[PDB]
Amino acid sequence: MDPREVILCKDQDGKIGLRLKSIDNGIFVQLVQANSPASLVGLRFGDQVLQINGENCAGWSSDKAHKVLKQAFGEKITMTIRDRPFERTITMHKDSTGHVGFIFKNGKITSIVKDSSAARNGLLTEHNICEINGQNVIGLKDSQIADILSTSGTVVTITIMPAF
Amino acid sequence: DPREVILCKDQDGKIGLRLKSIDNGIFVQLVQANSPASLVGLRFGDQVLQINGENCAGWSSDKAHKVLKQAFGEKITMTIRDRPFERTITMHKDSTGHVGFIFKNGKITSIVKDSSAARNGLLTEHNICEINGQNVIGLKDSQIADILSTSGTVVTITIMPA
Ligand SMILES: CC(C)[C@H](NC(=O)CSc1ccc(Cl)cc1)C(=O)O
Ligand SMILES: CC(C)[C@H](NC(=O)CSc1ccc(Cl)cc1)C(=O)O
């Protein structure tokens, strides 16, 4: 909730590696490209953008935010950021079959299995998986998320966020 | 961390709770003033994990309400997660006494350009839960405006997605 400032420099192709999305008259980070200027200043999926070059993003369309970034004079772009403000952590325990009890697609939880640790702990659907046991899984394929869950110990801590 | 709470039904057999199904969970939509619910610390936005040791996962609002109504005895147990969607934003009134938002039915509907609300990233389609620690769930819009108009310069609002 406490804002922080980041300075980006456009790469060789003139890009910062960011897709922004207008939600509820705010601006949120929808995509950070691996190894991008955005990635290197710590921008993450679900970050809220309060200011671009000291101008308020309030009520901006996705297009406007993107036009402002594209037209930005010179190499140096400032953003005022709230770090993943809607991020929440839930702890589950694997059952005798090694399952916590949820289905997901494209890193979004789609159903909760009856009588599972996910059910007991009130895990929610229409939430994106951000981290498993402190490991960032944004941008991983579903099979890679399953690989991490399958190799986990009994305790599974998942960081979630309401989906875009 | 969830907590377990014990409610004793009032003289009418009620706990003073309205529940809502969201994202295959169950959430507190209303806590009646001075109700058994109120007295064990339940608030708008609390998540209900268990009622009498049964998982609420995937229950309709109706089912949660039927289970509460059918509960035999003086004593109802719930497992509660404290307001997991709760977000607090601090704003400062401008020279005209405004923070810079419009709301309707306790729900923020627009952010005024160049306002404290704009600078602080206040969001629309969010319900106002508290103003400076005071609960405003169930208040009429004009009563919410009265509280904002009476506030000091510092306005801390607790919001939640609608
Ligand atoms: C992986 C765990 C979350 C496990 N759940 C599932 O296997 C169903 S979800 C899934 C979806 C796409 C792929 Cl590629 C792999 C798994 C559990 O409930 O513990
Ligand atoms: C009330 C505050 C939030 C103030 N905002 C407004 O005057 C516009 S919103 C409003 C809606 C319904 C009623 Cl009945 C009264 C006011 C501000 O921007 O500080």
Residue numbers in the entry:
A (entry chain C): 110 to 273
B (entry chain A): 111 to 272
Share the article's original sentences.
Syntenin is a small intracellular scaffold protein that contains two PSD‐95, Discs‐large, ZO‐1 (PDZ) domains that bind SDC, an N‐terminal domain that binds ALIX (via three LYPxL motifs), and a short C‐terminal domain regulating the conformation of the protein and accessibility of its domains (Baietti et al., 2012; Grootjans et al., 1997; Saito, Nishioka, Iwatsuki, Kumagai, & Sasaki, 1975). The PDZ domains of syntenin bind the C‐termini of the SDCs (Grootjans et al., 1997), but bind also to PIP2 (Zimmermann et al., 2002) and several other membrane proteins, including CD63 (Latysheva et al., 2006). In contrast, SDC‐syntenin‐ALIX binding regulates the formation of endosomal intraluminal vesicles and the secretion of CD63+ exosomes that contain syntenin, C‐terminal fragments of the SDCs (SDC‐CTFs) and potential SDC‐cargo such as ligand‐engaged receptors (Baietti et al., 2012). Since syntenin activity strictly depends on the functionality of its PDZ domains (Baietti et al., 2012; Grootjans et al., 1997; Grootjans, Reekmans, Ceulemans, & David, 2000; Koo et al., 2002; Lambaerts et al., 2012; Luyten et al., 2008; Meerschaert et al., 2007; Zimmermann et al., 2002; Zimmermann et al., 2005; Zimmermann et al., 2001), we aimed to develop syntenin PDZ inhibitors and investigate their potential utility to control cellular phenotypes as well as exosomal‐releases.
